[PDB]
Structure formats: C-alpha cells, structure tokens
C-alpha cells in the first residue's frame, strides 16, 4: 500500500488502514512467521527459528489458524471477535505466524510502546486473527501484536518425561516474545517497552511466563485477563502419563514406552491427530465413572525447562519476574459462556442441594475440588437459602471463584509480596456485542471486557455513548500501563496500587476504586483447601 520493513530472516509486505479520526493510517502486517512450521519431525519439539526468504514476503493474509475442533473454534471467535463480521480462518500444523498493527509513520522516526496479545480458548482452540488490533494501535500510539502458538495435542502433548516434555504451545508463545525483541523496531516499536496481555488461557499464559527463567527480559509489564496459573483446569500437577496413553491408544498407538508413543504419534496426519482430538472429547465434561479422570483438556505441565516447579511453590521462592502486573477478573465468570461451550449439565431454572453436590463433584476438572469437601462447599454458597433459582446463582458464583476470582487475588497478593507494582480490577459491564442468546441479566461474563480492551465500538455498530467512553477508558488505562507500569492518567479515574489495602478498580459504567476484592472468598477457600 506500499509499506516494506525488513526483519532479520527477510523483507515483509503489509497494508494500510485507516480508522475513523485517525489521520495516518496504521500499518498491518498479517501472517509474519516467528518459527520454522512444525512439521513431521518438528512436532512435539521446541520452535525453531523460521528459515531466510529472499525478496517480498507478502503480509496481506491471515494465516491459518492451528489445528484445532473448526466448530468450536469458529463458534468462539464469533463470540469474542472485535470485527463486524468473523473472518473464517483455516486450520494447520502450520501454524506459527503474528499479526502486526503498527500506527506509526515507518519513514518516521517511532519507539512506541508493544503490547502483546495471547488468546484464550483453554488451550484447545483460539486464533490470534480474531483480535483486531487497529482501534487500540490508532487510539493509544501503541505497537499491537497477535501471536499465535500450537493448540490440544500439538501444543501440550506431554509424556511427564524427557521424550515429550510438554509446553510447546508456552515455547511457542516464548519464540514469539524473541521475534519481537529481535525485530519490532522495524515496526516502529520499543523492545525495551514490551507488555504482555492474554485472556483466559491467555491469561494463565502471562501468569506462567513471570514464572518462567525462559521468559526473562523478554517483557516489562504483564495483564492477565480473567485467568492466571493458579486457575487449575490449566495446569497439570501428579502424574500425566495415563492422559498420554488414552491419547496415544485413541490414536492406534502402542504404549510400550515413552520414546515409542511419542514416534508413532509423530507418524500420524494432522487429520488423525484431529480425529482424535475429537474423540477425546475435550472442552467437555465426562459424565461418566469418576470425575477425577475425566480431561476436559491438557495444559501446562511442570516440565523442568520452562516451569521447573509448580506455581504455588514458585511463589514461595520469589524468583519471577516483579515486574508491573495487573491481575483483572469479571463480575460473573461463569454466568453464560464458558457452561454454554462445555454443554454444561445447567439446563433448568433452578438447582437444589444434592444435583449441587453431585454437580460439583462431576465438575472436579474445572474446580478441582476434593470430595470430602464438597459438602462443607456447597453449603458454604448455597444453604442460606431454600430458594433454588438463588441457588442456582450461587453456584456459578461458586465456580467462579473457584476458577478465577481467588486464583487471581492469590497470585496478586503474591506478587505484591515479592515488590512488584500490582493492580487490579473487576470488570462489571454487559456488552451490546453480547450474543443474543445469553440472559440479559448477565453481566461481566467471561469475555466480556475484550470488547472494551479492543474497541469493538469503534469498530462493530450499535454501540452507546456509553460504552464508547467505556472503551476509550479502557485502552487508556491499559495502554498508559504498557507505558509506565501504571495506568493512572489525567482524566481517568484513579485506579489505586494493589498494595497492603488491597485497592482496585471495579470498571463498568460507573468506574471507581474499591477495596479487598475476593477477601472473604479468599479466606474461605483457602482455610478449605488446607483441611
């Protein structure tokens, strides 16, 4: 259009877009390799760095979308897309591209501030095309990347030892945070102003890289969105070896020993490992023998290279990086999305007592919550009424909590006590993007605030002058943070330290501080948990 930077492997051509008041329009640069395509071989191992090219990269398309389930994935980026229309991506091994909005004049002189984004989607399924990156880059002169990284098997396939470690996905995510230092430059970006960002996964992900020597001055600031590495449904402790047998009988292989499971599964076709990504039945919950084997996914491991333990204790020890953190959750986590994608067994109006239980112990993949104290929980939430409607809403406030609201405010808490400028926030808005099919009644679901963060108003029709300004504010707080470790500015509300009082922001349409988020959940569970 005609912009053309070169980066160490080669010259890449991108393309102009301009945003309503927005002189200069920003440049974006789609489907930038960070890695060799993991291919045959490559499968189960490290990235690689990506090969030279000679001449004219063009930058123009979107690229694949990792293997994934296409109707889950499609179905959420549908949901959580900043773009008027969803852009129906492809899927492959060959997976391992950023997206790139940069709004500065590349002729100019520029050393913005990066932010990189990581998506969600459990670590399953996700794209980094379905974030938008022009309204935050024009609104707040910041270098925004989407990063894509290995998905399900592909990703987390792990063994428990030396033959398949696990992670690839977080090595990938890794390999994407040294392309940038190595290169953003050249698009008008600081490499010593890099903020990481994710949301859910995402976010667990962000949790795990400032637990991670492997990610060391590779960012400055980091935001996790409705998830961190104390949310437990990601991260497996104990001994993961018997998930590697189901997955590697399910896909025709023996289990004779680790090597050997690894090189058949390194014979298969994408369309085998994803046949048997559907039979695994993932992002679902297992209604069948026990709950405590039933795998609504893998994740993270404890692996030794990039976790060397697990995050609990690399709290203890305080060897992460303290730099600044914000930790956000939102007002009702569970209320609609992620049940309405798991086909959770929430159906009628109402629940009472003994489904709770039952309910509970079958949802021991998400919560991770010991039989015994099952009782004692669910009386904890839902005894002080014989309402069953309330009951109802008191559960997925329970799992809430459970998932999210205390994981967050422990990790926080934590790094506040290691010296690390903390923030936090609870996020209580319900999007006009909302899908039609959740209860208008619900309000800061799980997702909700990336509509905000991207600038789906600017971008999607229908919105109030309401949410535009919530938006505006949004990107300005997150985006002054990318700039100074804090997100206060003048003409903002004042969003206090996450220090010993414990502030925060309760962000919605009536943005103020507040104080001790999650306190007496915090108390509840924890004294629960050490039973």
């Given at each position: 259009?005609?912009?053309?930077?070169?980066?160490?492997?080669?010259?890449?051509?991108?393309?102009?877009?301009?945003?309503?008041?927005?002189?200069?329009?920003?440049?974006?640069?789609?489907?930038?390799?960070?890695?060799?395509?993991?291919?045959?071989?490559?499968?189960?191992?490290?990235?690689?760095?990506?090969?030279?090219?000679?001449?004219?990269?063009?930058?123009?398309?979107?690229?694949?979308?990792?293997?994934?389930?296409?109707?889950?994935?499609?179905?959420?980026?549908?949901?959580?897309?900043?773009?008027?229309?969803?852009?129906?991506?492809?899927?492959?091994?060959?997976?391992?591209?950023?997206?790139?909005?940069?709004?500065?004049?590349?002729?100019?002189?520029?050393?913005?501030p990066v932010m990189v984004?990581?998506?969600?989607?459990?670590?399953?399924?996700?794209?980094?095309?379905?974030?938008?990156?022009?309204?935050?880059?024009?609104?707040?002169?910041?270098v925004?990347v989407?990063?894509?990284?290995?998905?399900?098997?592909?990703?987390?396939?792990?063994?428990?030892?030396?033959?398949?470690?696990?992670?690839?996905?977080?090595?990938?995510?890794?390999?994407?945070?040294?392309?940038?230092?190595?290169?953003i430059?050249?698009?008008?970006g600081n490499?010593?102003s890099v903020?990481?960002?994710?949301?859910?996964?995402?976010?667990?992900?962000?949790?795990?890289?400032?637990?991670?020597?492997?990610?060391?001055?590779?960012?400055?600031?980091?935001?996790?969105?409705?998830?961190?590495?104390?949310?437990?449904?990601?991260?497996?402790?104990?001994?993961?070896?018997?998930?590697?047998?189901?997955?590697?009988?399910?896909?025709?292989?023996?289990?004779?020993?680790?090597?050997?499971?690894?090189?058949?599964?390194?014979?298969?076709?994408?369309?085998?490992?994803?046949?048997?990504?559907?039979?695994?039945?993932?992002?679902?919950?297992?209604?069948?023998?026990?709950?405590?084997?039933?795998?609504?996914?893998?994740?993270?491991?404890?692996?030794?290279?990039?976790?060397?333990?697990?995050?609990?204790?690399?709290?203890?020890?305080?060897?992460?990086?303290?730099?600044?953190?914000?930790?956000?959750?939102?007002?009702?986590?569970?209320?609609?999305?992620?049940?309405?994608?798991?086909?959770?067994?929430?159906?009628?109006?109402?629940?009472?007592?003994?489904?709770?239980?039952?309910?509970?112990?079958?949802?021991?993949?998400?919560?991770?919550?010991?039989?015994?104290?099952?009782?004692?929980?669910?009386?904890?939430?839902?005894?002080?009424?014989?309402?069953?409607?309330?009951?109802?809403?008191?559960?997925?406030?329970?799992?809430?909590?459970?998932?999210?609201?205390?994981?967050?405010?422990?990790?926080?808490?934590?790094?506040?006590?290691?010296?690390?400028?903390?923030?936090?926030?609870?996020?209580?808005?319900?999007?006009?993007?909302?899908?039609?099919?959740?209860?208008?009644?619900?309000?800061?679901?799980?997702?909700?605030?990336?509509?905000?963060?991207?600038?789906?108003?600017?971008?999607?029709?229908?919105?109030?002058?309401?949410?535009?300004?919530?938006?505006?504010?949004?990107?300005?707080?997150?985006?002054?943070?990318?700039?100074?470790?804090?997100?206060?500015?003048?003409?903002?509300?004042?969003?206090?330290?996450?220090?010993?009082?414990?502030?925060?922001?309760?962000?919605?349409?009536?943005?103020?501080?507040?104080?001790?988020?999650?306190?007496?959940?915090?108390?509840?569970?924890?004294?629960?948990?050490?039973?």
């Amino acid at each position: 259009s005609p912009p053309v930077v070169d980066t160490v492997h080669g010259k890449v051509l991108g393309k102009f877009v301009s945003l309503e008041g927005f002189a200069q329009p920003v440049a974006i640069f789609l489907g930038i390799p960070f890695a060799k395509p993991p291919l045959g071989p490559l499968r189960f191992t490290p990235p690689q760095p990506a090969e030279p090219w000679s001449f004219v990269k063009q930058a123009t398309s979107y690229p694949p979308m990792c293997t994934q389930d296409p109707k889950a994935g499609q179905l959420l980026s549908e949901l959580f897309t900043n773009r008027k229309e969803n852009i129906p991506l492809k899927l492959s091994e060959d997976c391992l591209y950023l997206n790139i909005y940069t709004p500065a004049d590349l002729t100019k002189k520029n050393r913005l501030p990066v932010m990189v984004w990581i998506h969600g989607g459990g670590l399953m399924v996700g794209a980094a095309s379905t974030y938008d990156g022009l309204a935050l880059a024009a609104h707040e002169n910041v270098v925004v990347v989407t990063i894509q990284y290995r998905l399900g098997i592909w990703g987390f396939f792990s063994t428990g030892d030396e033959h398949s470690r696990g992670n690839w996905g977080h090595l990938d995510q890794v390999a994407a945070l040294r392309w940038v230092q190595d290169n953003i430059a050249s698009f008008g970006g600081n490499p010593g102003s890099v903020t990481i960002f994710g949301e859910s996964a995402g976010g667990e992900s962000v949790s795990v890289l400032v637990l991670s020597p492997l990610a060391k001055n590779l960012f400055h600031r980091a935001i996790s969105e409705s998830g961190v590495a104390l949310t437990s449904v990601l991260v497996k402790k104990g001994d993961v070896k018997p998930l590697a047998e189901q997955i590697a009988i399910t896909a025709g292989c023996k289990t004779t020993t680790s090597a050997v499971m690894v090189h058949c599964l390194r014979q298969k076709t994408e369309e085998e490992l994803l046949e048997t990504t559907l039979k695994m039945k993932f992002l679902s919950l297992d209604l069948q023998g026990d709950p405590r084997e039933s795998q609504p996914l893998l994740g993270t491991v404890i692996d030794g290279m990039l976790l060397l333990k697990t995050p609990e204790e690399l709290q203890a020890e305080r060897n992460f990086h303290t730099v600044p953190y914000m930790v956000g959750i939102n007002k009702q986590e569970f209320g609609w999305l992620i049940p309405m994608l798991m086909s959770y067994p929430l159906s009628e109006g109402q629940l009472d007592q003994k489904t709770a239980m039952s309910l509970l112990w079958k949802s021991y993949p998400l919560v991770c919550i010991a039989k015994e104290l099952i009782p004692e929980a669910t009386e904890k939430y839902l005894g002080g009424t014989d309402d069953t409607v309330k009951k109802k809403d008191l559960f997925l406030d329970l799992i809430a909590d459970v998932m999210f609201g205390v994981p967050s405010v422990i990790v926080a808490r934590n790094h506040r006590d290691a010296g690390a400028p903390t923030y936090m926030y609870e996020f209580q808005y319900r999007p006009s993007f909302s899908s039609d099919m959740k209860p208008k009644t619900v309000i800061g679901d799980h997702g909700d605030e990336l509509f905000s963060v991207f600038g789906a108003p600017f971008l999607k029709e229908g919105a109030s002058e309401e949410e535009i300004r919530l938006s505006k504010m949004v990107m300005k707080f997150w985006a002054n943070f990318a700039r100074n470790g804090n997100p206060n500015g003048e003409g903002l509300p004042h969003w206090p330290e996450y220090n010993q009082k414990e502030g925060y922001l309760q962000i919605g349409a009536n943005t103020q501080a507040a104080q001790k988020l999650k306190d007496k959940e915090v108390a509840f569970w924890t004294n629960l948990f050490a039973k």
